[PDB]
Paper text:
Crocagins (1 and 2)24 are very small, intriguing RiPPs that possess a tetracyclic ring system, which consists of a pyrroloindoline fused to a tetrahydropyrimidinone moiety. Here we use in vitro experiments to demonstrate that three proteins, CgnB, CgnC and [name], are sufficient for the production of the hallmark tetracyclic crocagin core from the precursor peptide CgnA. We further show that the hydrolase CgnD liberates the crocagin core scaffold, which is subsequently N-methylated by CgnL. The crystal structures of the homologues CgnB and [name] reveal them to be the founding members of a peptide-binding protein family and allow us to rationalize their distinct functions.
First, the structure of [name] was determined to 2.0 Å. In [name], the metal binding site of Zn2+ 1 was disrupted by mutations in two metal-coordinating residues (CgnB numbering), Glu274Lys and His280Tyr, and no density for metal ions was observed in the [name] structure. As expected for homologous proteins, the Cα root-mean-square deviation (r.m.s.d.) between the structures of CgnB and [name] was only 1.2 Å over 284 residues. The aminopeptidases form an extensive dimer interface, and the residues involved in its formation are largely missing in CgnB and [name], which rationalizes their monomeric state in the crystals. The leader peptide is enriched with positively charged amino acids, and both CgnB and [name] show a large, strongly negatively charged patch near the possible binding site. We found the binding of [name] to the CgnALP to be almost 300 times weaker than binding to CgnA (KD = 514 µM). The main driver for binding thus appears to be the core peptide, and it is tempting to suggest that [name]’s role may be to recruit the substrate peptide to CgnC and present the core peptide in a particular way that enables or accelerates correctly timed catalysis. [name] appears to recruit the substrate peptide CgnA to CgnC and assist in catalysis, perhaps by presenting the core peptide in a specific conformation or by ensuring appropriate timing of the hydroxylation reactions, but does not seem to possess catalytic activity itself.
Numbering used by the authors: 17 to 321
Amino acid sequence: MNASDFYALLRGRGMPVVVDDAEAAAVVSELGFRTVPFEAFDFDSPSEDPALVIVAQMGNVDALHGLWERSGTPLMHLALAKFDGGLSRLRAGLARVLAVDTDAALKRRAEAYEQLFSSASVEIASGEGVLRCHIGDEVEVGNCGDTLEQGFLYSVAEFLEASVVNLEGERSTFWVEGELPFDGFIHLSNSAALKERWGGMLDEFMRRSREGANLVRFADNVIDRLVVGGVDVTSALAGLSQGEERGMAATEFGLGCADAEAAEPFGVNSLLHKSAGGAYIGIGKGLRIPHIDFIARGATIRFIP
């Protein structure tokens, strides 16, 4: 089945919503959905009927990932626990998911991937800055399709963005250089340990980013300057990044393909922040460095053949 039909069934309350928290379940029930506890949903039996999985407790993220290639149901998920599991993020996140024009987003995403596959480089203009993303001959993408294949899981945000990833190597697909003034950032952690080591500092950066004057600069694919709230914080980030994963190397670049209806303000850690236009550049893998995306919501994009 198609992503477009999935989003249509979701807006029509035509599928169950699997939830791992009773308070979140009550919020989802108030929006008109049938809710099923996470431990109670039959993920095994083959089924053509889809479901949305909302994961608000970090303790269930390993179980969510374990559904990969095992689930009998077409699924998307909203893994709030990896970002910020609070109820306000659930309410706002669901408002955004139910408001976005997903058909237009899927068309823009298709066109963007074809551009990313046919370009030597991409220029991202944000204020006075220009970030250049040089794309290689073999382009790695997390997901360029429009369908939900059996056993695969997808974040609800996946079909609203077009992204290329340095999956195999530090620059197996692209490398970046230049400056990106940005509106805000988000950060994804796949474990409680990681979120505890990094969250205090990143939430402080998040707080300070609301005062604008945010800039990330890349040299030879690696951050060499980070400014948040007009304050250089490069050494803070480098201190925790030291010796982990690929340090401050760019791991992902992408374009937000959706409208901005009910989009949330920067300064909260919403997994939907990349989708509402512009472009973003990311570091980390979410394993020993959070996957951090610096987002320029109003950036303009030029593809170079």
